[PDB]
Design a protein around this ligand. Structure first.
Ligand code: URA
Ligand code: CL
Length: 224
């Protein structure tokens, strides 16, 4: 099916170069299901980050791959449905850095939709995973799709801050080598990496300063 039926029109146009590759991922996922290998998030959420406008992205957050526990991943990186408790460990760590950085109260729930509505792209390098099996779809073809997405954002030459969480930061910095783009990296907020440099990294305020430096508006990070 055309990308216009799956994602927002700006993103469908941006992802043109990889439309074949998306179709290929569709076929891969169907074959996974036929083989009894379920994946997460749900099909209809795989491309959810791309359903918010391409032209409005001011901050890109890039994680690794989706939550591996059924019931967590929703297609916006790090987000969960509002009724999910406990929060997954990465999100609880995100939220503690949020309060330390911004001084806002702990959020009421784990739903990051407000960020997505305000120009934050909640991306993962790999857009699917098998239950209970982190990184199990690494190297299966998403990387070309997400590379196109990152490079197409950069190519707009609009103010853009990328927050790179975890191992793929190095790989990714060159994709953001363009005017009006800044990439900032840290270790990932996951259980055993967060205390190796995610905590104390102050990404929210930093992104805002960098945006304002460039003449852009800051993100209102405040969650209900
Ligand atoms: O979306 C998610 C969830 C956990 N870890 C990630 O890297 N991204
Ligand atoms: Cl986690």
């Amino acid at each position: 099916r055309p990308l216009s039926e799956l994602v927002e029109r700006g993103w469908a146009a941006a992802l043109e170069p990889v439309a074949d590759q998306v179709a290929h991922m569709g076929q891969f996922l169907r074959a996974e299901i036929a083989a009894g290998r379920r994946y997460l998030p749900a099909g209809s959420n795989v491309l959810r980050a791309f359903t918010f406008p391409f032209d409005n992205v001011r901050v890109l957050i890039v994680g690794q791959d989706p939550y591996p526990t059924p019931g967590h991943a929703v297609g916006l990186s790090f987000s969960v449905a509002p009724d999910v408790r406990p929060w997954p460990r990465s999100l609880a760590n995100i939220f503690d850095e949020y309060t330390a950085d911004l001084g806002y109260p702990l959020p009421s729930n784990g739903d990051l939709t407000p960020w997505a509505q305000r120009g934050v792209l909640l991306l993962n390098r790999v857009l699917t995973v098998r239950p209970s099996n982190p990184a199990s779809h690494r190297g299966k073809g998403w990387e070309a799709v997400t590379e196109c997405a990152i490079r197409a954002l950069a190519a707009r030459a609009a103010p853009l801050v990328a927050i790179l969480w975890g191992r793929d930061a190095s790989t990714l910095k060159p994709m953001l080598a363009a005017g009006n783009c800044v990439a900032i990296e840290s270790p990932h907020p996951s259980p055993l990496s967060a205390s190796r440099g995610f905590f104390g990294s102050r990404p929210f305020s930093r992104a805002n300063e960098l945006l304002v430096g460039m003449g852009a508006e800051p993100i209102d990070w405040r969650l209900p």
